[PDB]
Amino acid sequence: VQPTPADHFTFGLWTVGWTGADPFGVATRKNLDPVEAVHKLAELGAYGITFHDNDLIPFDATEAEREKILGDFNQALKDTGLKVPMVTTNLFSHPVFKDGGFTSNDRSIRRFALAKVLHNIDLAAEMGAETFVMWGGREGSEYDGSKDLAAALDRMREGVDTAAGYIKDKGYNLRIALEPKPNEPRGDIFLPTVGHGLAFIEQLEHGDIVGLNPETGHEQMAGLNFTHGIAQALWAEKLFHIDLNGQRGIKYEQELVFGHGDLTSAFFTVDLLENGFPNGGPKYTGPRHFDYKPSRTDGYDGVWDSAKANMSMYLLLKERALAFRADPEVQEAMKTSGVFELGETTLNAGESAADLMNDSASFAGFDAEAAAERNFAFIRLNQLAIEHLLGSR
Amino acid sequence: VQPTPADHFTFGLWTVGWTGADPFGVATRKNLDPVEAVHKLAELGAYGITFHDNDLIPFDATEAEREKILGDFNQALKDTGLKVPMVTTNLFSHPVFKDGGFTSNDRSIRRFALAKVLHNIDLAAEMGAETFVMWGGREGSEYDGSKDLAAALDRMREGVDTAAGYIKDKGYNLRIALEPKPNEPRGDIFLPTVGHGLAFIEQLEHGDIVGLNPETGHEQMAGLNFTHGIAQALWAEKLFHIDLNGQRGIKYEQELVFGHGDLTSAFFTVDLLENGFPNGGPKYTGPRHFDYKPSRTDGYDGVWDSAKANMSMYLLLKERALAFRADPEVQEAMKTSGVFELGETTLNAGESAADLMNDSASFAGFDAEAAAERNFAFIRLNQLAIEHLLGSR
Amino acid sequence: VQPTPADHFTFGLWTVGWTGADPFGVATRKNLDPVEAVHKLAELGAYGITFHDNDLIPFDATEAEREKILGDFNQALKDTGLKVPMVTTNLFSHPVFKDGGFTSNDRSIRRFALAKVLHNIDLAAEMGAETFVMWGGREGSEYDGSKDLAAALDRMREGVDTAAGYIKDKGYNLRIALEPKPNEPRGDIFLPTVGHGLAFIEQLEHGDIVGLNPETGHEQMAGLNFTHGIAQALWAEKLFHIDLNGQRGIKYEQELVFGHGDLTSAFFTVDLLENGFPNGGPKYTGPRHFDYKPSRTDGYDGVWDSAKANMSMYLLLKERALAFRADPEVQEAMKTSGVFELGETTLNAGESAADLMNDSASFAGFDAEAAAERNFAFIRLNQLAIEHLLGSR
Amino acid sequence: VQPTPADHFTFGLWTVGWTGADPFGVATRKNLDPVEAVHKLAELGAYGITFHDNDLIPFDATEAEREKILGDFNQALKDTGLKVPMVTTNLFSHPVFKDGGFTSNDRSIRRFALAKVLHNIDLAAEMGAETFVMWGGREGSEYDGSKDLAAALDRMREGVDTAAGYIKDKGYNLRIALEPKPNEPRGDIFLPTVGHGLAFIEQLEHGDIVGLNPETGHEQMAGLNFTHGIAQALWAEKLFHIDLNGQRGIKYEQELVFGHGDLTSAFFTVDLLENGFPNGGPKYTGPRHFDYKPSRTDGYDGVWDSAKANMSMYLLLKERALAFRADPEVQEAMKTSGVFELGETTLNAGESAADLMNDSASFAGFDAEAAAERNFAFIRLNQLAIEHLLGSR
Ligand SMILES: OC[C@@H](O)[C@H](O)[C@@H](O)CO
Ligand SMILES: OC[C@@H](O)[C@H](O)[C@@H](O)CO
Ligand SMILES: OC[C@H](O)C(O)[C@@H](O)CO
Ligand SMILES: OC[C@H](O)C(O)[C@@H](O)CO
Ligand SMILES: [Al+3]
Ligand SMILES: [Al+3]
Ligand SMILES: [Al+3]
Ligand SMILES: [Al+3]
Ligand SMILES: [Al+3]
Ligand SMILES: [Al+3]
Ligand SMILES: [Al+3]
Ligand SMILES: [Al+3]
Secondary structure, three states, rough: OOOEEEHHHHEEEEHOOOOOOOOOOOOOOOOOOOOHHHHHHHHHOEEEEEEHHHHOOOOOOHHHHHHHHHHHHHHHHHHHHHEEEEOOOOOOOOOHOOOOOOOOHHHHHHHHHHHHHHHHHHHHHHHOOOOEEEEOOOEEEOOHOOOOOHHHHHHHHHHHHHHHHHHHHHHOOOEEOOOOOOOOOOOOOOOOOOHHHHHHHHHOOHHHHEEEEOOOHHHHHHOHHHHHHHHHHHHHEEEEOOOEEEEEOOOOOOOEEEHHHHHHHHHHHHHHHHHHOOOOOOOOOEEEOOOOOOOOOHHHHHHHHHHHHHHHHHHHHHHHHHHHHHHHHHHHHHHHOOOHHOOOOOOOOOOOOOHHOOHHHOOOOHHHHOOOOOOHHHEEEEEHHHHHHHHOO | OOOHHHHOEEEEHHHHOOOEEOEEEEOOOHHHOHHHHHHHHHHHOEEEEEEEEEHHHHOOOOOOOHHHHHHHHHHHHHOOOOEEEEEEEEOOOHHHHHHOOOOOOOOHHHHHHHHHHHHHHHHHHHHOEEHHHOOOOOOOEHHHHHHHHHHHHHHHHHHHHHHHHHHHHHHHHHEEEOOOOOOOOOOOOOOHHHHHHHHHOOOOOOOHHHOOOHHHHHHHHHOOOHHHHHHHHHHHHOOOEEEEOOOOOOOOOEEEEEOOOOOOOOHHHHHHHOOOOOHHHHOOOOOOEEOOOOOOOOOOHHHHHHHHHHHHHHHHHHHHHHHHHHHHHHHHHHHHHHHHHHHHHOOOOOOOHHHHHOOOHHHOOOHHHHOOOOOOHHHHHHHHHHHHHOOOO | OOOHHHHOOOHHHHHHHOOOOEEEOOOOOOOOOOOHHHHHHHHHOOOEEEEEHHHHHHOOOOOOHHHHHHHHHHHHHHHHEEEEEEEOOOOOHHHHHHHOOOOOOOOOHEEEHHHHHHHEEEEHHHHOOOEEEOOOOHHHHHOOHOOHHHHHHHHHHHHHHHHHHHHHHOOOOOEEEEOOOOOOOOOOEOOOHHHHHHHHHOOOHHHHHHOOOEEHHHHHHHOOOOOHHHEEEHHHHHHHOOOEEEEOOOOOOOOEOOOOOOOOHHHHHHHHHHHHHOOOOOOOOEEEOOOOOOOOOOHHHHHHHHHHHHHHHHHHHHHHHHHHHHOOHHHHHHHHHOHHHHHHHOOOOOOHHHHHOOOOOHHHOOOOOOOOOOOOOOOHHHHHHHHHHHHOO | OOOOHHEEEEEEHHHOOOOOEOEEEOOOOOOOOOOHHHHHHHHHHOOOOEEEEEHHHHOOOHHHHHHHHHHHHHHHHHOOEEEEEEEOOOOOOOOOOOOOOOOOOOOOHHHHHHHHOOOOHHHHHHHHEEEEOOOOOEEEEEEEHHHHHHHHHHHHHHHHHHHHHHHHOOOOEEEEEEEEOOOOOOEEEEOOOOOHHHHHOOOOOHHHHHEEEEEEEEEEOOOOOHHHHHHHHHHHOOEOOOOEEOOOOOOOOOOOOOOOOOHHHHHHHHHHHOOOOOOOOOOOOEEEEEEEOOOOOOOOOHHHHHHHHHHHHHHHHEEEEEEEHOOOHHHHHHHHHHHHHOOOOOOOOOOHHHHHHHHHOOOOOOHHHHHHOOOOOOOHHHHHHHHHHHHHO
């Protein structure tokens, strides 16, 4: 399997650009030149690149520095043909953000964080980005009494709605995508999971242009099922973007290569992305963005290898997912388990609650005993799924 | 601390009625008479009782049996003065529900589960219940390919948005409240957490009368912060009911006495329930319902002791929560940490995104370095919180 | 892949015999005749069968009942040719064991539990079993103050170091193997993991004949790495037996089909079992025992399918594990990562601590900077591993 | 409660010296002068201080720098009167240790790591330390195939035994204490828990002087019960040292103030440390060492406050633990639950397995039914425990 930009694979400048500094150690790799990264990724078959405002332009950059960086970067893009489908703001690294940006207890910091975002929205617009991601890594708490939970959600809404209103006023072809995370760095991050993110969006005045940007590792740190999460986001029509990576359990965020964490889950995630829902429905058209980090034990060759690995893993899983669903045995297995039967409405055409209630066959004279004897055969269906993933059947 | 019905403490018939049967053993206690339970609870200071349709009337009960049970039960209620603030349906114990009720792949089972619910709504109405809870214990899967995730959410919506319409047509003073859980008896249960529940509610046609019924142990099984969860539910004005209990980690549902799991979390949960939000806002008025199980190692005396314990724990935590907030030192500590400052809007009165952007003091000439030096003193605030909980002040 | 008794696959009578009763529901299947089970398993290609004393002979069985059961069972074994490599006692189902067997606070219960075990040792001897497993499911606590932790470990030692002495005195060709578990049905079970089990064994007087019987799902419920666990058990030469199954996260014991939980982990577990250690060392010769439960949603066909699935999964993973190591590219990748280099002793032949200390090249004049530049290429090695698992090479 | 050196509270130079740099951000505080730290801690009531070799002397320090640092430090110690009960080596921060020290696949790195340790042993000896801690943070893997698990345990044993042999040859009054940790930084760290540590110690040639140094947060990251862990370590007589801190769940290591994580667990941990075991047994005499980090949101005042908090928390919990056990009601509650009964040997004086087997009253004619009716009253005992912790009874 050889990737092409058609596949729409994208990488964050910070993924391959990660030098290795972690909680208990220093960087293990030298810095990666943004122009070099753009050229290497292009060479690898990537479709686009993403970045935080500060991945490209340093926090303390002067106008001449900002100008030369952007200049070089834009020339690199024009040469390679790489796209910039998504941009995001860094509201977590600088010490000023120690208590968050949008929900920092300090008001001047909140104003600064929002202004930083508004400016980044202009850059994204110039970059031609289609999605503006927001990952509130610092919005949370270690202690329960450090925040007025209601106020926090208000300040969060204020920032997001202000940003969204700005996009609307400027007429930018942009959409904001929130990225939930349970914990880390924060002990408890606000809007910890996909569901909390979706619900929050319903309280926004400009919710029409705000969606989600779920992450495999993020939902898994909460012990939840990622495929199920994105499925609900797709169902709600809020799956604006997606971050793919690997996580091996409820622990610190590993951000491994996609498919290097929960393999079977990864297989089913791609199945959903590529095949959509069995009884029909919407499909995700956005970019297949990888948000991982090359393990600090490896050198630059390993870095480029991990970039390839992400795309290979996806392409391999994809083949198996398509063959999986194409298998006639899988089709009959699906029928037997009632997969398509679930697609049938419970109530009959034009039937009301009262009608159902007074339908003896459905309740009073219903044989729940015989009904309970149905063999759903869910285990066999799963065995066929796994065999396809292994490349047996 | 001695509880009174004024406190509005309620218990499920199934809590104290649990005989001890678990996954690896049989029941360790005898059959708790529902009339005896009503009398004992009344005696203990409880305000009301709750139950699954089958806790009271057996699945295979004949009309004469149903009539004598309800008759005795109603007389018990009239004597004791106990209220029945909430009722719920049992869509998990009978083998027919092995693949769920509302989202069972089998259509006839879905119809039966819904009819069972519609009938239970009439009973709740007669019982004078105010809330109708729904815990989709069996709605989920062990394998990812067993369900069409979109269809499942459709069938789920159909059921609720079937039930809710019925309530409206009948003119019942009832509100549906969903009881989210990450997993068990299922591997992955649909709408695993508060957030997923809130978001789901936004896709309903009759969402105006559907809310949540969060549980301490349920959110904790996902490793999430319960206080934060209910806070978001309160903020969204969807906190219709609440199940209080104890959970000691991410494992099977222990359903311990409230305060017997995460103590500090429990303290802050009550703080929120009693004190509400620091900068003002809504407060929970519903019943303080305990949904636990007396450990199978204990006999009936232990059962009645655990019932008392729940109320004692709450009343003890309550005193400490009130004293906590009443402490002048805690007030100044809250000021220093910026708890009230968070209650201030980021933007100024009538200020726009553009104004903020072009405010040099807020961005261009902003001193993020000096700003970063603020000592939020979150640790000291937490120490004062804990000292109050310990009765040290 | 078609299994044969040569593979030495064994199943517990209770695995396929599980009727579906779980914490929140009743049994979904009928009574599996032990003779039928023996015949079906034989037919499936199983090498042997295992069982709890009560799986075969009921707790309240009379002599005539015991005699007819054993009689029929032995005839079934003689016909099929199935072996009984392992037997275990049921010290968890009966209400008398609500607070454990060996560590129950009640002394008469401890004596009864031990006597029950001593008798079961005679049966195992007659069955020709080689391993006597012990899963202290009820040995633990929900509350910290319920037990004197030192005394508990003493009573635990007394029981084993009572049983082991008995085996020795009788001259039985048996070895005890402990089945560690973090929790359930208990909140906290004594000797929660492989390590605690191994350490405990070192305090026993008859530790020479006591080992471990690790379980995939058990170690995973603690979030630990199973392959790493058995590796340490193998290293310590205490891997007497093994229970294989699937677990999808830190939650209740799912006991899924082997390979139906953490797929990549399963692959590496088999790799270790079949290939052993790269630089040489001991290998596990015992039976490949499956300790799972056919999901309650499925009927008897599903039951027999799950039995096949376990063996298929193992055989499929096995092929991929052998091919994995046989791959020349994998061999060079292993060399580059230093897999064999780790097999080299740190100190030189006859070198002492003092010599090392005063070796400038190793410390004083050591270039830790250049040394830090080594590309271990651990990511690429993992990619090759996964590609083999997927049947991509 | 006001702490004094009599209490034997110790802090690591790196605890209060932590500037705030974490995975997703930079340091938030200025550097703490080691001499200032020694003076402040003395002032606070601390008994001693601990440090990694590099906390005090930088990796790239020249002889003159090393000499002036140690000189100033020793004068500070002599002035304040602070002791240095424990010293440890830093085998995780420098990039050379990216794949571990003792178990690094690279042999020259293993030799360097061991030499670094041997030299640190001399320093500890000069510092008058009594315990030499070893926390193998980098010894592990992200991928299963990166290491030969047997070889890894061999290299680990080689380093520890070489170090221990050195101590013996030099005649140093030192004892090595291993510090297990599940994961982080490493995805999977070797000897992840107390049990694995204890078991490993039994394979060592110089195990007589090697013990454990458990950490609250470390065992909790594995979801295990800390009190139970140290209890087994005490029982095995391997509790050489202890690291106290707070952890709120299975996630990244928070290293909060002791008592700021799991409160009830903390209470029972101190209960064990202070009260020992109910039926008698050994007690921990070592230092009460705090290994935490002042939250990066706080300034230096917060730092000093957190130092006080640790000692206050312990002293507060201590009072409640003593009063708890002193309470006559608690004594009778303990009797009823059988806490002291567990201290009774199962077998009678001079009784054998055979005697027990043939004791009808203990098996054949044993009434397991009546026996099963005992009310252990474990819930009430826990309620009394919690009430003491809250300061009610
Ligand atoms: O976890 C079990 C659930 O909480 C139920 O008992 C609900 O209270 C109502 O169905
Ligand atoms: O988790 C349940 C345990 O694994 C048992 O079933 C053992 O196999 C033997 O008692
Ligand atoms: O700005 C958010 C980025 O996409 C990531 O670095 C986060 O997901 C970290 O988890
Ligand atoms: O050298 C080990 C120290 O005691 C700590 O910093 C570790 O526990 C980190 O978890
Ligand atoms: Al991301
Ligand atoms: Al991320
Ligand atoms: Al409930
Ligand atoms: Al519940
Ligand atoms: Al088992
Ligand atoms: Al098991
Ligand atoms: Al430490
Ligand atoms: Al630590």
